[PDB]
Design a protein around this ligand. Structure first.
Ligand SMILES: NC(=O)C1=CN([C@@H]2O[C@H](COP(=O)(O)OP(=O)(O)OC[C@H]3O[C@@H](n4cnc5c(N)ncnc54)[C@H](O)[C@@H]3O)[C@@H](O)[C@H]2O)C=CC1
Ligand SMILES: NC(=O)C1=CN([C@@H]2O[C@H](COP(=O)(O)OP(=O)(O)OC[C@H]3O[C@@H](n4cnc5c(N)ncnc54)[C@H](O)[C@@H]3O)[C@@H](O)[C@H]2O)C=CC1
Ligand SMILES: O=c1ccn([C@@H]2O[C@H](COP(=O)(O)OP(=O)(O)O[C@H]3O[C@H](CO)[C@@H](O)[C@H](O)[C@H]3O)[C@@H](O)[C@H]2O)c(=O)[nH]1
Ligand SMILES: O=c1ccn([C@@H]2O[C@H](COP(=O)(O)OP(=O)(O)O[C@H]3O[C@H](CO)[C@@H](O)[C@H](O)[C@H]3O)[C@@H](O)[C@H]2O)c(=O)[nH]1
Ligand SMILES: O=c1ccn([C@@H]2O[C@H](COP(=O)(O)OP(=O)(O)O[C@H]3O[C@H](CO)[C@@H](O)[C@H](O)[C@H]3O)[C@@H](O)[C@H]2O)c(=O)[nH]1
Lengths: 454, 323, 460
């Protein structure tokens, strides 16, 4: 049967865009996006959405109330839907066994049990959340216990900031399901939904475990690249080579690809580190410590890169930063989003705060309450100010610290900035956005240090 | 670490894969970089040339006969020497990463071929050098990782040193757990059992055996006392003897002239090189003449699909990245 | 040519105050102005009760306070009037962030340099007496080269100090040597020579060494290294003595008679204290980890670890002889200063021994002849103090009913106590743990009296 009603438990960075794009593409399907956070739902029904995603505002306003809905009423959405997406979060457990390593599956378990408490007849439950391998066996055991529901895997590959383009023109779609009769009917049903706008060559079908594991493996390879090119940047700094030339060189070899080779202060975002940690913690239970400590190097290098960079700043400021004003330009974890999950800016700020530095922080899309929240747990009242515009942040600053590649940081007037900074002045370029702009800054008198230059 | 023993350099008074500023001091008391990346010579992805200036352009002038200036990259010399290494790093690291994934698959019922397929369709990742195996071989890869590791130990960059050292370690793990897998399947002992080793080259379509995983699987099985019968189409007999020597070799190694005679009375067939001729073998013939139960360890994913036939023929088959 | 006639010293502490009082005493024709932010301190200098205890200091200060020696909170005006500016502030170990517990906190220095280049014009010599990491001057030079003014020409020197507390006045008046470092340029050597001219009034010329800034800074550290290494080395031997039957004092004598080794700083102890020895080693250990010298770092780290071991060994001997329980047991701590003839407590082994016994729930009664009472209370805090710490007005009150007497500071008076009397009112068995060897030779008398006496480097 053709899927006519779709429910998505979890209206976050996945459930919101992914269902907006399903509705814009499939006008004969009813897509209700639900969530327990009533303020989140209400924001999804607002002129100011709860997440900044380019193109997302257009897409939502094009369907909300035609076939795109956002509701707090979790039950009826499931009861009447033909397909329930699970797109809830799977953080790293902060407690109990595996604290700091294992993924917390309590929010998935919550969906699985509310689905069966609120549904009759035939429905397709799809796991889009990034789970461990064989987690779809767990939903199956639940459904075969409190007894007709099928369980599928359809991970997402959207990266935040480019989520709309990536959802309209995906490299591939991954659908994993049972190798049974009942399962292969449910898979080709989900294919039908995607086939409205994804070509069939770019829809990949496998079994449940191979799918759950492909998502982790892909994120490992991606994260590994960054760390790999990040490690080269420290190599460059010690041999006077240049990480951008080396990266450009590496990337011309077609078998390597030219993507994901931009050195940086450190990868951030909701998923990479938690997924790597997840896979490592998987490996211990499976008695696979080599695989475990192999991928663990992807995290160690990231942590190194951030620390090395944080120390770069303190060392250069004549080894002390207590009571010194420093500007942090960029708090989002990447450009063109307002998500600050695991942003390297948190980790540099927290390092600089431990030295007693007074921070002035600016970011175009990140709301101030998030920064205050991210930097706390007061120490924040004393040391952290949040600036309305950048020139305010650098007024009387000893140093300018760029942690996010917002294109506008080139556009700044460093003549003006230099006139009002304490002397001597420094710029610490954590994203290489200022390449080529050096000689200017050098003549202006700024001392410019960046990732991958001696 | 790099055996730089220079002998090329001083004789002169462009490059090899090196860690050139030593040249400019010998010469101080025309030095560019131009490393290599088979018959690849004809349509190179890119031609690397590094210096400090018309000399880069003389060497651009020579390549330009068949490579367009778009595909020719000039840089400083340090960045040229580094770029050669880091490429091989990223390449070798892809292989070790996918090898690590295979172990994961074997323990969870995923297929490394399905997982690699899904991985590589991410254009950012790219789908080259993602075919799991028993271990990467060849002159440059392991040499180049170690070389860079030493270079890091001597620049006080141990975080970096030990990060890339995992590319070697995981390759070592992939080779030993395969060997360990052969031995465990044959009831924990392999002493005096004939085992057929199929394929001694490091990749297919070469005679090159340098650092071939076949060397290390064979040596592992030699430490147990297995009777190895080795056959490889192009690798010369005497190179096998030399590669396993340093007597242990004479007591345990037969170099067979064809695969069917090396598989006769064997407990296991261990495929280490991806020669296509191994796919086309009469495996129903092999199995009648092998001891029972017969085994096939496919360290190259060359028997994919044929499993049902082989399994029904009565063969017991184990392959990388699929239980 | 150029003569220093006005000296400002930012920092009125154990260095700034004595070094300037001596300078002023020997040079009637130079105006020495010692400034500090701490108004309660400055005011104590202008009082008859000086803020620190140094034998002879009260004499030297009173000799020229109001004539050519002054103490003022007016940090701004002294800078602007001075021909020479001493930076003499503290460089503690960072208690936070990167290098916590290792690296030196340069914030106070950096504060001086910016306040100097703000409040100053014309020609001044900026001199770094505080103990800094190698190259720390170079940071001051850069601060001056970016915040420059018309006709401002601030010169930067290294003039490290070697006085020991408890001998500061004697050391400042006949120092083994003076160390001055400056850039090997025209401008620097001018300023180097102008600082020599000052010291030349009372110090022999040959004893005035001139080097570059680095060499100067590093020398101060290395000397402090070599010094502490001797203590930790003899303390190491003392351990081997209690295990073998040797006697550290006998061994120390035999060692120091070799003139290549020399016979000073071989007096084994519960462990070295004072503000500089531990931090200066750690500072250098930290400095090596940035210089990619891991072998040198761990070489010097041993000085600190041996001293931490000498202390904890002693604390454990006490606790073991009280059968590993000390709860509510009275114990007398004689000596809280880090050496005799001083009020200073910074890093005094007495603190650490008191902390080890407070973790056992003992009732400590502490007596010191010079350390002020609230200092001890501060030093033992961060109430555990309320329940466990009494501060004694005299040693006999401190030993009244005690299980043990722990001598930590070699105050000459402890050796003269009425130990017959102490013993009568102690609980038996009645221990004396001598952490300073001040009671050697009284072992026979103390033993017939009934005391259980133990000491560093003597076998039990
Ligand atoms: N952010 C990204 O780029 C991508 C993330 N993923 C994965 O997709 C998942 C979704 O992550 P995000 O959307 O970024 O996180 P999120 O925190 O923004 O979304 C989770 C939402 O689900 C709601 N929720 C949780 N449990 C619920 C329950 N029992 N009932 C109803 N609502 C519930 C929460 O209130 C929250 O608003 C994660 O597992 C992530 O690893 C996969 C691909 C891309
Ligand atoms: N005490 C000793 O035996 C010797 C120490 N040194 C070195 O000399 C330095 C001075 O140490 P001490 O005098 O013993 O320490 P201290 O703590 O007694 O003296 C420092 C004084 O400077 C004041 N101060 C700090 N920053 C200031 C500022 N910006 N403006 C004005 N006043 C400020 C403080 O309030 C304090 O009164 C240390 O770095 C030490 O390593 C060198 C030789 C001997
Ligand atoms: O060359 C690069 C590329 C990325 N980054 C950093 O990597 C982090 C994450 O970037 P990105 O990959 O876009 O993060 P996400 O937006 O979370 O997307 C990733 O994680 C998602 C959730 O697992 C997957 O859906 C996507 O495929 C995957 O790209 C950011 O902080 C970037 O600054 C670099 O430093 N250098
Ligand atoms: O998907 C793959 C691809 C290769 N391999 C194995 O890994 C090795 C790769 O060898 P190969 O790449 O052919 O080695 P070389 O022929 O020495 O050349 C490589 O190393 C050179 C030196 O670093 C570079 O110039 C080349 O671009 C690079 O392909 C072989 O043993 C293969 O069997 C796999 O296991 N999976
Ligand atoms: O043989 C000895 C000598 C000293 N100490 C102890 O070691 C510590 C240090 O003693 P001392 O050297 O007098 O301390 P300071 O008074 O701080 O002076 C030292 O530290 C100063 C600051 O760096 C330097 O200027 C001096 O040269 C150097 O002697 C004290 O707690 C002593 O009890 C011993 O245990 N055994």
């Amino acid at each position: 049967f053709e899927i006519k009603k779709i429910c998505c438990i979890g209206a976050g960075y996945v459930g919101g865009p992914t269902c907006s794009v399903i509705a814009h593409m499939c006008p004969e399907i009813r897509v209700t996006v639900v969530d327990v956070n009533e303020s989140r739902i209400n924001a999804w029904n607002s002129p100011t959405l709860p997440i900044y995603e380019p193109g997302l505002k257009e897409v939502v306003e094009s369907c909300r109330g035609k076939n795109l809905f956002f509701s707090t009423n979790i039950d009826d959405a499931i009861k009447e839907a033909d397909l329930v997406f699970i797109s809830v979060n799977t953080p790293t457990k902060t407690y109990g066994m595996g604290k700091g390593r294992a993924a917390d599956l309590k929010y998935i378990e919550a969906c699985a049990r509310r689905i069966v408490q609120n549904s009759n007849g035939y429905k397709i439950v799809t796991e889009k959340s990034t789970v461990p391998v064989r987690a779809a066996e767990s939903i199956r055991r639940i459904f075969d216990a409190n007894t007709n529901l099928q369980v599928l895997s359809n991970p997402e590959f959207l990266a935040e900031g480019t989520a709309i383009k990536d959802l309209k023109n995906p490299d591939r779609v991954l659908i994993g399901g049972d190798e049974t009769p009942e399962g292969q009917r449910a898979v080709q049903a989900l294919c039908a939904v995607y086939e409205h706008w994804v070509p069939r060559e770019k829809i990949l079908t496998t079994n449940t475990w191979s799918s759950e594991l492909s998502k982790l493996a892909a994120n490992l390879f991606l994260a590994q690249r960054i760390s790999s090119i990040n490690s080269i940047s420290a190599l460059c700094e010690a041999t006077g080579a240049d990480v951008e030339e080396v990266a450009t060189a590496i990337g011309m070899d077609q078998r390597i690809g030219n993507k994901f080779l931009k050195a940086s202060v450190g990868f951030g975002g909701s998923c990479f580190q938690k997924d790597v940690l997840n896979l490592v913690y998987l490996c211990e239970a499976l008695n696979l410590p080599e695989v475990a400590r192999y991928w663990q190097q992807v995290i160690d290098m990231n942590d190194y890169q951030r620390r090395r960079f944080a120390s770069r700043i303190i060392d250069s400021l004549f080894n002390t930063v207590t009571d010194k004003k420093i500007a942090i330009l960029g708090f989002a974890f990447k450009k063109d989003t307002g998500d600050t999950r695991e942003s390297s800016s948190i980790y540099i700020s927290k390092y600089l705060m431990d030295e007693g530095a007074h921070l002035h922080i600016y970011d175009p899309k990140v709301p101030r309450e998030q920064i205050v929240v991210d930097l706390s747990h007061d120490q924040v009242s004393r040391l952290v100010t949040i600036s309305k515009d950048p020139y305010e942040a650098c007024d009387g600053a000893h140093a300018v610290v760029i942690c996010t590649e917002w294109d506008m940081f080139k556009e700044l007037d460093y003549e003006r900035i230099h006139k009002k900074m304490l002397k001597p002045a420094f710029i610490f370029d954590g994203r290489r956005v200022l390449d080529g702009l050096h000689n200017e800054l050098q003549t202006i008198g700024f001392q410019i240090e960046t990732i991958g230059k001696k």
